């Protein structure tokens, strides 16, 4: 009975959102945020081999699809790689954490990809930051996704996508 009560009530994924406030207590640390940001920059481009290495860590098998850039060279954008994990009906229009000062235009038209635009499960614009996947951040993209698709989807997304972020930061190079 103790084991059953521990499993059905105190499992970690069921308690992702803290009772203190309506926000996720589990989320991207400092390194996950940097990896997600560098993967979600508008300028990133990934070849087929790099995409395969990135997605190897995740437990994802499926059709990659046509690369976002077909000519001159086949390139997969980091947002395209990310969008394979978002649910196919998920809409978000929040600003990113980088739009916290002068560089913010408070609109989805800013040339700086500081405004997260996700439509039908496609990361069309913006970058992931502390305000997108960060821990202790209520009303974030991760918080909305968990609240709308259950803690089991929350755990699945965390594992796979965050391992992908760390792998990309491994293969790009982050130093001081």
């Amino acid at each position: 009975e103790a084991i059953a009560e521990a499993r059905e009530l105190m499992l970690v994924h069921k308690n992702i959102i803290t009772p203190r406030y309506g926000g996720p207590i589990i989320g991207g640390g400092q390194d996950y945020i940097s990896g997600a940001y560098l993967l979600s920059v508008k300028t990133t481009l990934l070849t087929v081999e790099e995409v395969a290495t990135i997605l190897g860590v995740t437990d994802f098998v499926g059709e990659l699809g046509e690369p976002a850039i077909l000519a001159p060279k086949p390139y997969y954008t980091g947002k395209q790689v990310i969008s394979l994990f978002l649910p196919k009906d998920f809409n978000f229009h929040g600003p990113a954490n980088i739009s916290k000062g002068p560089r913010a235009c408070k609109d989805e038209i800013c040339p700086h990809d500081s405004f997260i635009v996700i439509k039908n499960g496609l990361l069309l614009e913006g970058v992931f930051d502390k305000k997108a996947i960060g821990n202790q951040q209520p009303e974030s993209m991760l918080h909305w996704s968990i609240r709308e698709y259950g803690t089991e989807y929350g755990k699945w997304l965390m594992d796979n996508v965050f391992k992908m972020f760390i792998r990309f930061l491994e293969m790009r190079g982050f130093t001081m």
């Binding site: 009975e1 084991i3 059953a4 009560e5 499993r7 059905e8 009530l9």
Partner: protein
């Protein structure tokens, strides 16, 4: 008719099952299966031999006969069935 929110609460929890009641049902069924009670679902074709997993799958299916009687503070008692025939 204590308040509108009280009525909303009461009509909401009539047809649903709280996580405490789910945990109690699963623990009771697991304890029963451990002592030697015969499972109702098909034993074979299950990836997990754990008793807890079998009880959880039984609860998800709804085969196990368990009725939860909740006693309201005013004396009203509500019976909720898990059979889901």
């Amino acid at each position: 008719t204590i308040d509108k929110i009280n009525e909303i609460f009461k009509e909401n929890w009539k047809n649903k099952l709280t996580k405490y009641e789910i945990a109690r049902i699963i623990s009771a069924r697991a304890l029963q299966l451990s002592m030697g009670a015969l499972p109702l679902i098909d034993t074979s074709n299950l990836k997990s031999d754990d008793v807890i997993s079998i009880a959880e799958e039984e609860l998800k299916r709804g085969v196990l006969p368990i009725t939860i009687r909740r006693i309201y503070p005013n004396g009203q008692v509500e019976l909720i069935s898990v059979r889901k025939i």
